[PDB]
Design a protein around this ligand. Sequence first.
Ligand SMILES: Nc1ncnc2c1ncn2[C@@H]1O[C@H](COP(=O)(O)OP(=O)(O)OP(=O)(O)O)[C@@H](O)[C@H]1O
Ligand SMILES: [Mg+2]
Lengths: 46, 828, 390
Amino acid sequence: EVPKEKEKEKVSTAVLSITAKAKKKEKEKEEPEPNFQLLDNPARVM
Amino acid sequence: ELSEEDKQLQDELEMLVERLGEKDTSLYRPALEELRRQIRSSTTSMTSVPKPLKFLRPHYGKLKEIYENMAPGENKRFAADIISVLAMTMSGERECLKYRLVGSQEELASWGHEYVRHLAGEVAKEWQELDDAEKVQREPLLTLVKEIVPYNMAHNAEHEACDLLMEIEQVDMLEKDIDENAYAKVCLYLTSCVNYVPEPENSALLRCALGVFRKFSRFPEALRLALMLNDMELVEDIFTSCKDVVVQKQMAFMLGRHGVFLELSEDVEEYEDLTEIMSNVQLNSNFLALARELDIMEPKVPDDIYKTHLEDSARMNLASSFVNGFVNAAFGQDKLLTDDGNKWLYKNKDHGMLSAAASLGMILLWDVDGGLTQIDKYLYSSEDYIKSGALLACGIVNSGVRNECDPALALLSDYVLHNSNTMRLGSIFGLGLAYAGSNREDVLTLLLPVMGDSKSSMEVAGVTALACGMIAVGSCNGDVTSTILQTIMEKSETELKDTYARWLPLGLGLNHLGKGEAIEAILAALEVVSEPFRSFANTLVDVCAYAGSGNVLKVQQLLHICSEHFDGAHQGVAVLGIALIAMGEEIGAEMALRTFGHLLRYGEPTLRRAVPLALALISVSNPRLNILDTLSKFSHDADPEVSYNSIFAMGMVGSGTNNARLAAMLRQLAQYHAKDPNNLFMVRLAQGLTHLGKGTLTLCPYHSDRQLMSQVAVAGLLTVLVSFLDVRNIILGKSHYVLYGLVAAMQPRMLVTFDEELRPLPVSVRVGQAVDVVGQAGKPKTITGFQTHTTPVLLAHGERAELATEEFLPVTPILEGFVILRKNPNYD
Amino acid sequence: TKGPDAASKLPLVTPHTQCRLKLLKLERIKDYLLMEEEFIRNQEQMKEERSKVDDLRGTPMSVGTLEEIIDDNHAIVSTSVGSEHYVSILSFVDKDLLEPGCSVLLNHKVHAVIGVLMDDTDPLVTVMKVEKAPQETYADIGGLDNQIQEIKESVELPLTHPEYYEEMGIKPPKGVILYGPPGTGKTLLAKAVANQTSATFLRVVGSELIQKYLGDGPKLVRELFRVAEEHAPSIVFIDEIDAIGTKRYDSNSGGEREIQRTMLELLNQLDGFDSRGDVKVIMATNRIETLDPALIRPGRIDRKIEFPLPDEKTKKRIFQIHTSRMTLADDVTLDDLIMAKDDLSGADIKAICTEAGLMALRERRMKVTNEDFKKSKENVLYKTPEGLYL
Ligand SMILES: Nc1ncnc2c1ncn2[C@@H]1O[C@H](COP(=O)(O)OP(=O)(O)OP(=O)(O)O)[C@@H](O)[C@H]1O
Ligand SMILES: [Mg+2]
């Protein structure tokens, strides 16, 4: 597929003295894996 | 490399510890006694290198093992105390109190004061690293805190106790240990810390300091702190919980200078005197007395300011009207309008007339009766613009003065809902700036109904939003919020793109100024607007909420908004918001200046236009070369809007200062932009601002000690600056009348004294810079650079006045504005 | 009129004591700095004709001295190796801005005028600018109230309140000389001016304007005052000016004549034929008597400020200032050291405080004491017959 478009990213929003306290305040306020293969008559067999 | 006695002590300690190691279990008690005696003898001494502590460093682990392996009993804790005092030096897993709790629990002073300091810091650290559970583990730490706070009180370490209590997050126990010899040095420290901490700790510290002040009957300081908290019940309690009448008079002066007005019943000793003081009915008389006492009552025409003699179609004449109003503000007398009259209110070419008449109001500022007379002469005109300007003039005249009668209400209510968006557009604004701090329901009941009706443009709706916000600044008035939100929800993407719609979010923010967190609801009930008018409204209401809060997280969010590339006006609002959240603490302001410079360089035009407004807001009537140079080097910018804003910001930063090296910049800039009328108008307006009230008024929204943020002043400043956020259309055109919003901010810059009878007492004072020598975490600030005058006197920015002689005691410990002075009984 | 250069300086944390309020103030400074850093990072993370114009411009552009511009598209330039060429001027150049002697830019190979480089300030004079701002505020100067007042009236009031002088048609002093014994605040009062001034401060030492070759010292002085006048308001602080400026005797050597020539160039800059902008000069001197009258003239040096050894109250101020940050004990009464009528500069008092602290540390005690101060006073001060009078 297409590699998709990567937008512009802000770099690791700076942590200030009280940023962790604000985050704490916000925290308080809140397979089968088949073993089989079937090939039609035109069979691309490696 | 030691000494013989030192080696002998080392050997003694080694022998004692080894005996502890030996499993005799019979002579443990003598050895522990001896170790404890040596350790406390060394620790309590003045030696900063306690020798027993030094020599037991190797054996720390062995002492741990001995503590663990000895059977429970008295010796257990009797050695745990030794282990703790040792751990005072070696740490990393923070043991000292971890072994003090299982200890002998003796007086927490026998082990010197260094032990106390270490254990206090460790109690704080344990407190932070405890979850809301483990409460049973938390009481024994409060016992150590009750042993530490008194000890710090007795040993001059009041700042240590304050730090311990504000870091334990319980600033409530100081009241038990404070003494009349401590309240000053504790309240000052708490107040200093307030500006820099966030909520809810900001309010916790403010209420703690208020309680300390109320304990010792320091009512004026308690009222200043109660005003910092925008809480009217507390100020009512303080103002009515007092028995001395003179101090109540002084507190009434303080309330009047601030925007508040207390409705007092018929119970206080002197209700009428107090309401007169708190209503500012004596502001005009005092101002005129000050003007007479300085020889300034001599109206100066605009030409005296332009000073074009040394070194007129339609707009420079509007500039003449505006500068005339600004210069001769609150003086009553004038020479252009007052006197000849009918000449600079005509030939102003239609729309400018609406503001020229308003100029009259700003000349008769705080003068209700003279206002009435001169304005009524002009209140009956064949053309609508004159009547609108006269109504606005009545509003200006009644601004800041709480007359018992309601002239503004009557006159301007007759013309609200008028069948013309020009009498509406002056009467609404007049009511808004006349009853700004009032919060009266009877004026909002008349204003709110006019935002919604087929016969109202975006101009009328926005000016009603401004008015309602100014009436109810920082009150979370449900009716105002509901009506503004309805008006925002009832208009399409177009019809919401007028730049007169900025004023509905501005009304919201003004109505929520300083409330802060409680704003989520309005930014949660506002996430349904169109995209281009939702970042603007969201950002504006957010910045208004945190006005003067100094919340670095919110400033970070605003800077994130600025970083985004949108080829977008909410970025301009975010720059002004960075200014708005940081006009409080001084340390924040200079750093914001650095940030604004970076924004000017690494910035798109949209926020480039907004940086000058931020510079104006952060420094209002505070001319500093750092900002004036910045604005001057940007007064020549290619972008017209950045220029315009830079010129007006030079006007604002120097407003009411008469600065000579700003007047020179403005004249040279007037020649430079002679051929551009759109810059000539703005330079003329900056000149008028620089000479505002001929050097007698300040637009700063911060009065008492630079610490009380007047809500009304911020309201006016925000109206004007947000209007500048679109200069080319809002103000360089139709709605140049919005400049008169500054009326809400202009407030004398004088010190005037009285006796205990409301009669002047000229007394000698020293006026000088707000400097100190050593803060020492609590020491007051003392003026440096004295200059002795006799009151009345004008205080410039950064100037404080201290009574040059001991003859009088001020009621308030702040000599700014009106101060009642008791005649000292002691002497002098 | 490039504008003031100023000197960026962070706020000052009022509480010098180690307490939570200081931590909050410093943390606020730091968090603002972090927001600024992230804002710059995000600007550069979210971010033709001029590029091709620069490509056409020479890659290793040379710098040459324009001389006798001709026509509107042809000028004679110099190669800085003595050779000169009749070069052409591309349209990229500004024109109406080239002046003879201006250090224009030339294409490396074809040698065509392509730039003007109007920033050809010599490194010797670019280094002597002040970009930092020493953290010596006026609150670190005990006493010297009159001297502080004089210098404020000379270099601060004319910038902060330029209405008093125009209101009486008076030109404020443009020159101050701070003279006194060895160590009294002469350099502190320039450090404080630099700290508290919004003007371009220019440190210089008289022993630095002297140059090896002939005619280079005067050229350096002319360049220094040219930059000081381009940036305005500006203050030029010539420390220890008696390096150049000593009496002008009749020389017999050549180096002495060149030094006197440098001094005359300085004199012409201070008060010469043409004019002087808003450049204010502060010289510093230990021995003023040896300076030339033409330099001490009260047209070049309007104010002369003596810094005598401090009296008793000033000495008490010095001890207070320099023991403020010291954990002084309650056994110390800083009056015994004051009273002794011996020559004590502020430098001597600071050395006394430092040596007292070192004596305490030697005794293993972090809190100084009176015996420590006595020992320090005895051991720091290094340097009429009896009965001849009285
Ligand atoms: N009045 C004063 N107040 C405070 N400190 C002072 C004072 N006078 C001198 N000092 C101290 O002197 C030391 C430096 O003195 P300074 O540089 O001002 O001397 P100076 O007059 O320039 O000397 P010199 O002629 O040797 O260059 C610093 O410790 C400064 O604190
Ligand atoms: Mg020196």
